[PDB]
Structure formats: C-alpha cells, structure tokens
Amino acid sequence: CVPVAADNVIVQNSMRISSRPGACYSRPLVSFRYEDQGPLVEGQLGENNELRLTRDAIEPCTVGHRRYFTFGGGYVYFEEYAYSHQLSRADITTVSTFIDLN
Amino acid sequence: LGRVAIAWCELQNHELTLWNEARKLNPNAIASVTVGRRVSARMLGDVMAVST
Amino acid sequence: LGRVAIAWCELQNHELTLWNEARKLNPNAIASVTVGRRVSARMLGDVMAVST
Amino acid sequence: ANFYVCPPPTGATVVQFEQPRRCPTRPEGQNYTEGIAVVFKENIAPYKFKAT
Q: Glycosylated residues (chain A)?
C-alpha cells in the first residue's frame, strides 16, 4: 500500500448521489492528495483508514442511517448520510475481545 | 512464561482480525461473547450498536 | 500455570463463536478438522451432518 | 435451559473492540562475562611443619 498523510485527507459532507435520488454511498467519500502539493483525488473511504480509488460502494437510501466509521486515530459520525463531527477513540465504550493472562 | 505472555499478546492482537470478520458475520453472537451478556447487536459501520 | 489453564479454557469457550461462524462458512474443512479425518459436511442447520 | 428475545438495536449504545495491545518485549538478558575463577575459603587448617 501507499502511505498518505492525515492532513492530505478530507471528508465529504454527504454521501448522497445527486444524479440518482434514493441511492447513497454506504461508505464516506474521501478527497485526498498524494503529497502536500499533489492534486486532489476523488475517492471513497475503506476499512481501517484505507482509501478506495473507485466510488463504487452504492446502496439505496435508508432511514435512520446512524453510522460510524474510523478516521485516523478516531471515528467520524454520520446521520442520514450527513457528516456530524469527529470522535476520539475514548469517546466510545470499549469491549475487550482479548483474554487477560496476568 | 514471558515468552508465553508475549505469544498470548501476539495471539490476541493477531486474532483481532478474525474477531472483526466474525463481528461482520454474526454480530449478535460476537457481541454477546465479547460483552458477557446475551445482547442483540447490529454493526452500524465500523462500530457495533448493541441492545440488551 | 493455573492462570494459563484458565485463559486456555476461556480461549476455547471464546473462540467457539468463531468456530460456529467458520462451520457456517466452510463446513467441509471445519468438520474434517474437528473430527480428525478428512470428511465432507453438509448444511448443519444447528448440528453438522458429515459423511466420510 | 434459558431463552432470550433480542429487540432490534438502535444507535443509543455503541461499543468498540479494543485496539491491539502493545505486546511486552523480551528482557535484554543478563549480560554474562565469562572467565576463570578460584574461590578461596578461610584457612581453618593449621600450619603444619616438621619439628624435632
């Protein structure tokens, strides 16, 4: 994979598709530049800070679209395909999948 | 025992991805096993939303 | 070593959910490994049906 | 012998899996310096000599 600086990545305001009403992207869109002076590249978010070149994740519009997605060191909130705010890692209660061996 | 502890920490950090896949597959069972109480769940994206 | 044994029992009881998901995914391989002999499995429903 | 009913979860409660914990590192080990040695003990034996 090709590393990308955090500052070179931005969040699109909404996942709604203007061309096709009733359809929205299931994963937030990302506009990013390869370097500091690099051009912006239209893309879609992936899993664990991954960036997808193709904005192909398309789903029908759904009510109650309260979703969370990772973003750098924290999460980014959404409601009805609308950006809400950044979230820190500690903002969400953590359940431990690990099994302690003291 | 330090080798065992290091291997156990590596095993947890290494099965974390298996656990993520299992959460994507059967969120109710995975969330119940993780929390300790039988709870219904639904992964609303990168995070899991639960309900007792 | 008692802590190790307790953690191992917890690890088995805790990976049982991953194993249920894996049975749902690849029943042939999962049943073969669990039994100890290369066998073919079918739609379990709630219990694996196997055949040598 | 128990039964449960799971209502459809909402966004009220959100949980996350713990991040991969930092595995402990092996100790640097006891830096051992080899070499010959001759342990000496207190001479409780007397000083014997031949006298006439």
A: 102
